[PDB]
Amino acid sequence: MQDAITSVINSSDVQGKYLDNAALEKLKGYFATGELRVRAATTISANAAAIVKEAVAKSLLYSDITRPGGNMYTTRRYAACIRDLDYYLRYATYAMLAGDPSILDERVLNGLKETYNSLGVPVGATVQAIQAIKEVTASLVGPDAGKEMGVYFDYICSGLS
Amino acid sequence: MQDAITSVINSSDVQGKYLDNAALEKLKGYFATGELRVRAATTISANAAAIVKEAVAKSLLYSDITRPGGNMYTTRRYAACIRDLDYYLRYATYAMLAGDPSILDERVLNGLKETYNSLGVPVGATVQAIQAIKEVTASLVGPDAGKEMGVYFDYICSGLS
Amino acid sequence: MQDAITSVINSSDVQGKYLDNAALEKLKGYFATGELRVRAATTISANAAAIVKEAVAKSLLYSDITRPGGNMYTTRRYAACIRDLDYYLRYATYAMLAGDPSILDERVLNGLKETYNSLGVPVGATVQAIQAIKEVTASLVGPDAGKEMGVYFDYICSGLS
Amino acid sequence: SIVTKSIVNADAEARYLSPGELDRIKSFVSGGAQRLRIAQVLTDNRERIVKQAGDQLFQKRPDVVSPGGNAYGQEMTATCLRDLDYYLRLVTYGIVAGDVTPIEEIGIVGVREMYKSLGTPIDAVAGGVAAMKSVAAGLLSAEDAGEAGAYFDYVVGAMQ
Amino acid sequence: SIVTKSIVNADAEARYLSPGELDRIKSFVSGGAQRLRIAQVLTDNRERIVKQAGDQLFQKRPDVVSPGGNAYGQEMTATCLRDLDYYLRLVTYGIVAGDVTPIEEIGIVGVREMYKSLGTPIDAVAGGVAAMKSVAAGLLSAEDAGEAGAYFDYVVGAMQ
Amino acid sequence: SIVTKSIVNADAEARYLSPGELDRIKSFVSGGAQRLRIAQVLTDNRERIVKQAGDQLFQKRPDVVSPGGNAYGQEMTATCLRDLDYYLRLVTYGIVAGDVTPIEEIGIVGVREMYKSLGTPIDAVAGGVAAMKSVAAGLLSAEDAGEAGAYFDYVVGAMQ
Ligand SMILES: *[C@H](C)[C@H]1C(Cc2[nH]c(Cc3[nH]c(/C=C4\NC(=O)C(CC)=C4C)c(C)c3CCC(=O)O)c(CCC(=O)O)c2C)=NC(=O)[C@@H]1C
Ligand SMILES: *[C@H](C)[C@H]1C(Cc2[nH]c(Cc3[nH]c(/C=C4\NC(=O)C(CC)=C4C)c(C)c3CCC(=O)O)c(CCC(=O)O)c2C)=NC(=O)[C@@H]1C
Ligand SMILES: *[C@H](C)[C@H]1C(Cc2[nH]c(Cc3[nH]c(/C=C4\NC(=O)C(CC)=C4C)c(C)c3CCC(=O)O)c(CCC(=O)O)c2C)=NC(=O)[C@@H]1C
Ligand SMILES: *[C@H](C)[C@H]1C(Cc2[nH]c(Cc3[nH]c(/C=C4\NC(=O)C(CC)=C4C)c(C)c3CCC(=O)O)c(CCC(=O)O)c2C)=NC(=O)[C@@H]1C
Ligand SMILES: *[C@H](C)[C@H]1C(Cc2[nH]c(Cc3[nH]c(/C=C4\NC(=O)C(CC)=C4C)c(C)c3CCC(=O)O)c(CCC(=O)O)c2C)=NC(=O)[C@@H]1C
Ligand SMILES: *[C@H](C)[C@H]1C(Cc2[nH]c(Cc3[nH]c(/C=C4\NC(=O)C(CC)=C4C)c(C)c3CCC(=O)O)c(CCC(=O)O)c2C)=NC(=O)[C@@H]1C
């Protein structure tokens, strides 16, 4: 994976260049936000089970998806689905700390669509649950942190298409 | 895998239903003749090595297949071939007890044709050996149990075709 | 793998034949070359690092390939590349001792092009480096040994194409 | 079912069913009609079994239907009794199958994870299933109650 | 062959052949004509070697050519001698190769499974190969019999 | 950086960052402006740092710029100073990252294998990098020289 710092270094290194004014400005941009990323990560980590619970209650429960025949029916599938939502929240939080989505390509999305397609896991309902996680997270971390987390939630959703 | 019993349970569970008259009639269908499946399985298990030996003697031995240049020449290939016939008999017997061919799709047939084709294992001669196993099995378990076993042997042969 | 001896044995065995006049004459032909193969192998072994160094200096250095943005930039990629050339020289020397290219198919070429293609390793540049290894090797082992080594270097190159 | 479980156990040791496994299957099939009759009694009496089990549970754990409790309010109480009806249904499946596999695969794998996310006290769910066993036992012969009771006991033990 | 064996050993330690491995190859190929003459003499005498070894085996293991025996009757006896002819052929391959791997790959991997399926007592097959060694030895110099004998002994040991 | 390292550690144990990992990130980013200023000094003075380090190395190791030496002659001496300029650039990357990973991944993994193939004396390369540290230290506060010095020291130590 890369973070916002290693991304700038990699871009300079492939050119054989010392960090120029544009590179140093990009690094300053990341350093200026670092404590705000740590604050958002602390809040999410402390509330991670509660964020998933509220998102599930707003987007999936009391529907055909949890009723007999639905993809979230059976305790095994209920548990797999909320485990997946715990993964999306934890990896989106990593990506937000890094200020870079590369961890999502490497550790979340690689073969995920093909796995969902082989098992019959519904992508549309998964994207609705991720959208609920995005909105519940935003309610706790504030609009700025919520929009930044939303970039990474949207990146996961797009990777399922 | 599923058996005759779990197929009925799964069909009731996907509808959220307790077992209705139609489901109970299907379960009675399995219970009515289940002891005949157990009897045939007892006879096959007690005679498994002898069934494969006689089938090989009738269908493969003293031919171009076991002579230099045939696919059963070399002790390694001879042993792999009779191991494959032991697998077909053991799995066909499981499927017959279950009254369901799903174990064959999951544990025998998945990528089997492609494997044989990549190695140059002759499918025609394999189907002839399976036909000999069907006839030798029938001679021991009787014509009616022999026909039921033949359903599962034919399922394996079709999966190679 | 096979060598020139097991090639004759394998050809006799697939026909069910004891070694005939042609088989014994072919084995004599290989035994008569054995000391010349061992001589060439001893010279290559003693000069293995120097052969790769000279081949690299003639085919890869001071180009876009070693500069930032080229595939040999970074010490890790430089080292992986000369390790691959060490492998080609060592395996070509094995194939020459054996008088048979089968070790190349089994231990070098199986999925190699696909691996290079997935990593972005330039195959054209690799084949040019192998061609330089062929010419440097020939200068040390003499024209007859150089031609025999060139059969195996050409075999690796063709397998990468 | 006992058939699939015997096959899976034999397949894991690359062997035929033992004569002991085959004898258990023969015994299962021979009692098959009696297993269907037990399932039919639980099916026919499901309203009584669930309602009376609910009443017993809420007498021992009135906290779960008090303010702050997971089952507080008409709608959450109804959902609680729906879950007991789900477990009674799975117990009927286990009884006809002669093995806990259908119960395990539908209602036990991941059960702790589900109820923990929902905030449901799983010790009180287990208490509701134990209550259903006692009500069901009142509708059956001693022999039939012993057989049905083993499946109730499996659910209670898997939630503890 | 001795060449493949040296290469496989070198490859497993990511190295060129040792000076010792290369010296063994030079010594082997220098003796190559003498090894080919051993193979030619055993080939020229194959009918004699197999027939006389068969007679020795059947004298010491009368069970295999008696009622119930795997080789009982003219046709099964003939098939038994065919198998001894197979193993004599593989022994000539090992002798010219300087290594048992050609024998192992054609006639040893899976040999217990094959003979167990056929009902052939593999200790009697080993006895027949040991008999061929003693007959073959009578047609060779002491040095040549010692070399040939090592290949027969490998087969006998791999069947025990 | 320390950010990637903390995340990779957390990911390997399937957990959120520990409070200790989060505190390391907060400490790192708070020192960010100081790290950028150190990188800017080395970047602005790169010509001086490389040229003067080169002169010091060639005075300690005149053999590398004498006949038979790897850097002998105008063209090879220029390539030698190009390599020192590479290492100064990587040191600036390490300083902004707060750890050695960019230096390791670009210029240390495989470095002994590269220089061995080229015939370059890697103890003299290490000497050149040590010289750059001593020239750079003359342009920095004691505190800044201590921080920058750790990155030069990492390169020197990794080439022994
Ligand atoms: C929840 C909103 C929706 C589901 C989810 C659901 N997923 C699965 C199976 C599943 N999910 C994953 C995902 C990951 N594994 C990882 O290690 C990572 C990397 C961080 C991810 C993203 C995998 C690999 C699998 C398959 C293997 C497994 O079970 O662990 C299931 C189970 C399907 C089944 O087996 O039938 C379900 C139910 N389902 C819904 O209906 C929701 C919309
Ligand atoms: C016998 C009637 C015919 C053969 C058979 C033959 N098969 C193979 C290799 C082989 N077979 C399988 C099959 C299975 N493996 C499994 O695990 C299962 C599921 C239980 C099955 C059905 C596999 C996977 C393979 C390849 C790997 C292996 O060898 O174990 C060979 C060997 C070919 C070779 O390597 O040269 C042979 C000879 N040959 C005939 O001529 C008969 C008609
Ligand atoms: C040098 C002439 C050219 C390169 C080479 C280059 N190769 C690789 C990675 C690499 N190469 C191999 C090859 C083999 N591994 C084996 O075990 C064998 C058989 C003995 C061979 C032939 C592999 C499998 C791999 C990938 C895994 C690994 O790194 O070991 C790289 C590294 C790519 C990277 O990860 O960035 C390079 C640079 N590059 C050029 O530009 C030259 C033309
Ligand atoms: C009653 C004894 C206890 C409760 C129960 C309770 N459950 C729920 C929600 C609920 N329960 C399930 C259950 C299952 N899904 C399955 O696939 C299976 C296996 C067959 C079961 C058992 C689900 C899925 C849900 C979510 C709602 C939905 O159906 O989508 C609630 C409601 C909680 C809420 O919404 O806040 C309650 C009250 N609560 C207690 O306190 C009793 C001990
Ligand atoms: C003689 C010393 C002992 C016997 C031998 C015996 N063998 C057989 C049948 C037989 N054996 C083979 C052997 C091989 N196939 C290979 O690929 C190789 C490697 C080169 C060998 C050694 C085969 C394949 C067969 C099957 C027949 C065929 O050729 O297709 C028999 C016949 C048994 C039967 O048909 O009932 C016998 C008698 N028997 C003894 O008792 C001696 C100890
Ligand atoms: C100077 C302190 C010492 C030298 C240096 C020297 N180097 C070379 C050749 C050379 N160096 C590299 C270096 C790198 N490639 C990378 O990717 C990195 C990581 C950023 C490094 C450090 C390469 C690739 C090469 C080969 C030429 C090319 O650029 O393609 C030479 C030339 C040697 C020759 O051609 O004979 C020299 C002189 N020499 C000394 O003696 C000093 C101690």
- A82 C-alpha to center of ligand 1: Å? 9
DSSP B36-66: HHHHHHHHHHHTHHHHHHHHHHHHTTTSTTT
Cα dist from C22 to B103, B130, C14, E99, whole Å: 53, 41, 15, 21
Q: Give the separation between CA B97 and CA D1, rounded to whole angstroms.
A: 12
Residue C58 · residue C50 · CB < 8 Å:
no
3-state DSSP call for residue C85? helix
Measured between CB atoms, which of A2, A38, A90 is closest to F25? Answer: A38
Residue B34, judged by CB atoms within 10 A of its CB (0-12, 13-18, 19+), counts as buried
> Angle A49-A51-A53 (CA atoms, 0-180°, nearest 5)?
65
Q: Give the separation between CA C13 and CA E81, rounded to whole angstroms.
A: 18
Residue A71 · residue A121 · CB < 8 Å:
yes
Q: 10 Å Cβ neighbour count for C9?
A: 27
> SS3 breakdown of chain A: % helix, strand, coil, rounded to 5?
75, 0, 25
Question: In the complex, which subunits touch B with 3 or more CB pairs below 8 angstroms?
Answer: A, C, D, E
Which residues, other chains included, contact D140 with Cβ-Cβ below 8 Å and sequence gap of 6+? D38, D41, D148
What are chain A's domains? 36-160 (1.10.490.20)
Q: For F140, phi and psi rounded to 5 degrees?
A: -130, 155
- D24 C-alpha to center of ligand 3: Å? 59
- Tokens standing for residue B95: 């499927």
- The 3-state secondary structure of A12-50 reads HHCCCCCCCHHHHHHHHHHHHHHHHHHHHHHHHHHCHHH
**Which residues have C-beta atoms less than 6 Å from ligand 5?**
B 61-62, 66, 73-75, 78; E 64, 69-71, 76, 79-80, 83-84, 86, 106-107, 118, 120-121, 124-125, 128
Q: What is the DSSP letter of E62?
A: G
Rg (CA), chain E: 17
Q: Give the separation between CA C73 and CA C65, rounded to whole angstroms.
A: 7
Measured between CB atoms, which of C24, C34, C107 is closest to E25? Answer: C34
| Ligand that comes closest to the CA of residue C123 | 3
- The 3-state secondary structure of A42-86 reads HHHHHCHHHHHHHHHHHHCCCCCCCCCCCCCCCHHHHHHHHHHHH
CA F67 from centroid of its chain's CA atoms = 29
> Angle A151-A157-A158 (CA atoms, 0-180°, nearest 5)?
85
Q: Give the separation between CA A98 and CA C26, rounded to whole angstroms.
A: 66
Residue C77 · residue C83 · CB < 8 Å:
no
Residue C139 · residue C43 · CB < 8 Å:
no
- Tokens standing for residue B27: 């379960």
Cα dist from F31 to A7, B160, D75, F94, whole Å: 19, 67, 55, 14
Q: 10 Å Cβ neighbour count for F143?
A: 10
Q: Give the separation between CA A105 and CA E19, rounded to whole angstroms.
A: 50
With CB atoms and an 8 Å threshold, state whether D36 touches B28.
yes
Question: In the complex, which subunits touch C with 3 or more CB pairs below 8 angstroms?
Answer: A, B, E, F
State which H helix or E strand residue B1 sits in: none
Q: Give the separation between CA F158 and CA F101, rounded to whole angstroms.
A: 12
Q: 10 Å Cβ neighbour count for D157?
A: 11
Asked how this structure was determined, the answer is X-ray
**Given resolution (angstroms):** 1.8
Check if D122 contacts A (Cβ < 8 Å). Answer: no
Q: Give the separation between CA A44 and CA A96, rounded to whole angstroms.
A: 11
Residue C127 · residue C83 · CB < 8 Å:
no
With CB atoms and an 8 Å threshold, state whether E110 touches B75.
yes
Q: Give the separation between CA B16 and CA B10, rounded to whole angstroms.
A: 10
Does A103 contact ligand 1 (Cβ within 6 A)?
Answer: no
Q: Give the separation between CA A28 and CA A31, rounded to whole angstroms.
A: 5
Q: Give the separation between CA B108 and CA B130, rounded to whole angstroms.
A: 14
Q: Give the separation between CA B116 and CA E80, rounded to whole angstroms.
A: 31
D111-118 helix and D122-137 helix, angle to the nearest 10 degrees: 120
- Tokens standing for residue D102: 């259908």
Which residues, other chains included, contact F18 with Cβ-Cβ below 8 Å and sequence gap of 6+? F10
Location of structure tokens 């890869």: C60
- Tokens standing for residue F2: 């320390």
With CB atoms and an 8 Å threshold, state whether C31 touches E33.
yes
Closest alpha carbon to B74 in C19, E84, E97, E114: E114
Residue B159, judged by CB atoms within 10 A of its CB (0-12, 13-18, 19+), counts as middle
Residue B33 · residue B40 · CB < 8 Å:
no
- B95 C-alpha to center of ligand 2: Å? 20
- Tokens standing for residue F120: 């370059």
- D126 C-alpha to center of ligand 4: Å? 13
HSE-CB for C94 with a 13 A CA cutoff: 30
3-state DSSP call for residue A105? helix
Measured between CB atoms, which of D7, D16, D36 is closest to B24? Answer: D36
With CB atoms and an 8 Å threshold, state whether B80 touches E109.
no
Residue A23 · residue A12 · CB < 8 Å:
yes
Check if D156 contacts B (Cβ < 8 Å). Answer: no
Tell me how close the Cα of E16 comes to any Cα of chain B, in angstroms.
Answer: 31
Q: Give the separation between CA A48 and CA E17, rounded to whole angstroms.
A: 60
Residue F25 · residue F2 · CB < 8 Å:
yes
- Tokens standing for residue F124: 């003299």
With CB atoms and an 8 Å threshold, state whether E4 touches C6.
yes
State which H helix or E strand residue E157 sits in: helix E142-158
DSSP chain F: -HHHHHHHHHHHTTSPPPHHHHHHHHHHHHTHHHHHHHHHHHHHTHHHHHHHHHHHHHHH-GGGGSTTSTT-SHHHHHHHHHHHHHHHHHHHHHHHHTSSHHHIIIIITTHHHHHHHHT--HHHHHHHHHHHHHHHHTTS-HHHHHHHHHHHHHHHHHT-
